[PDB]
């Protein structure tokens, strides 16, 4: 069906440019316009601009100077570029398509690109096990994803096959300037002997991809 | 631009109840308004286009009404899966603008938490740092207190809490409290306790371990 898949989450240094690629499928860029919307702490949902079927572009008034949108119809790719970013440009940027080619009711969205504007350096996390031991036949276990920058980090269990009972807590910013979160899952104690439990940690900004096996100590 | 004022900021109801979302425009925008749902870590989801028109794949309990400056999004029989933020978007005037949103919380019966304490791994101790984690699993309401003690010494300022959003199925919360110590500090002590205070517990629950066993 109709899908919009954006490029991976990124860190941008202050005063430098942001570049995002929106690859579409299920429709042709010649028949629909692609809009760009961001969601920031200080302004919430904000419409940035759009590239139409025929190639024309409109940019929202505060971005006419530093916003630039292009596309490659044959490759089904739309290219978002914004210049001279600052801290209040830290937001989740979406590409979106409307129901009709001319309208603005966005029925299809990209997964979003979390953009962090910071002078700090990228840092991959360390994954530590939260080992169960000796609750009425229910054992809790998890992984500690510690000391990474910037956000985000993806955590699944058993390559996605284990979702029931999973809780992935929001990241907390430590005093060191690095993020840290945990992901837990509750399982039957009896399964701890005949089942393997792996957390799949992936920190795309640092290309850190780690699978941690969590066993009873 | 057009200012959209959503009201209230937070809505708290019980499953099966009726719930309405207010979106007021700084001037008449006719019916040119669209509603959006956004779950945790998700993208906006189109619920209603042009104040009242239905959207494909949207449950029939979602409907919208209103015209001019006062618009309403309604859920007749709200369900646990409806826990999300809800935004309105106008497009009668350029550029299209969004509201600030309304958070939809769901009331449910009190649930005592399941508490689990996790010692630091031997792997992390090699890095010169000890992290002790206490898990408060599937509880309601959100209010909860975690008290750390190290050899009966009250810990303060050296822990951080993280709380999940409401679960889409059982509407409960989960909390993780991480006590962080230097490895030297951790090795100088034995008893590591996590005391949990919650409305669903008649008495505080304490999970603890001794460093080593």
């Amino acid at each position: 069906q109709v899908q919009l898949k954006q490029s991976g989450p990124g860190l941008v240094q202050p005063s430098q440019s942001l570049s995002i690629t929106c690859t579409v499928s299920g429709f042709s860029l010649t028949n629909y316009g692609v809009h760009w919307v961001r969601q920031s702490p200080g302004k919430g949902l904000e419409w940035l601009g759009v590239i139409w079927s025929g190639g024309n572009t409109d940019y929202n008034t505060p971005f006419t100077s530093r916003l630039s949108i292009n596309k490659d119809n044959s490759k089904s790719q739309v290219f978002f570029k914004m210049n001279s970013l600052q801290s209040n440009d830290t937001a989740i940027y979406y590409c979106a398509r409307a129901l009709t080619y001319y309208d603005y009711e966005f029925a299809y969205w990209g997964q979003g690109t979390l953009v962090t504007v910071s002078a700090a350096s990228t840092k991959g996390p360390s994954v530590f096990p939260l080992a169960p031991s000796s609750s009425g036949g229910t054992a809790a276990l998890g992984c500690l994803v510690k000391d990474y920058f910037p956000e985000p980090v993806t955590v699944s269990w058993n390559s996605g096959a284990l979702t029931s009972g999973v809780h992935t807590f929001p990241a907390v910013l430590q005093s060191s300037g690095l993020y840290s979160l945990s992901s837990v899952v509750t399982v039957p104690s009896s399964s701890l002997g005949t089942q393997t439990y792996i957390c799949n940690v992936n920190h795309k900004p640092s290309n850190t991809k780690v699978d941690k096996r969590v066993e009873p100590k | 631009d057009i200012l959209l004022t959503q009201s209230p900021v937070i809505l708290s109801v019980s499953p099966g109840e009726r719930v309405s979302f207010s979106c007021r425009a700084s001037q008449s925008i006719g019916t040119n308004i669209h509603w959006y749902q956004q779950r945790t870590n998700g993208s906006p989801r189109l619920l209603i286009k042009y104040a009242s028109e239905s959207i494909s794949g949207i449950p029939s309990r979602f409907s919208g009404s209103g015209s001019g400056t006062d618009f309403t999004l309604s859920i007749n029989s709200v369900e646990s899966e409806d826990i999300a933020d809800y935004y309105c978007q106008q497009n009668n005037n350029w550029p299209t603008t969004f509201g600030a949103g309304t958070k939809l919380e769901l009331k449910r019966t009190v649930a005592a938490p399941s508490v689990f304490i996790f010692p630091p791994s031997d792997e992390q101790l090699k890095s010169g740092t000890a992290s002790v984690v206490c898990l408060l699993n599937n509880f309601y309401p959100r209010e909860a207190k975690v008290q750390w003690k190290v050899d009966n010494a009250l810990q303060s300022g050296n822990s951080q809490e993280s709380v999940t959003e409401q679960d889409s199925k059982d509407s409960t919360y989960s909390l993780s409290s991480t006590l962080t110590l230097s490895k030297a500090d951790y090795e100088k002590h034995k008893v590591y306790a996590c005391e949990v205070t919650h409305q669903g517990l008649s008495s505080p629950v304490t999970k603890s371990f001794n460093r080593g066993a």
Binding site: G44, P170 | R39, T40, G42, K103
Partner: peptide
Amino acid sequence: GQXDLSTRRLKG
């Protein structure tokens, strides 16, 4: 009332 980047949810 503000949007939190760590959850895509409104917090305060």
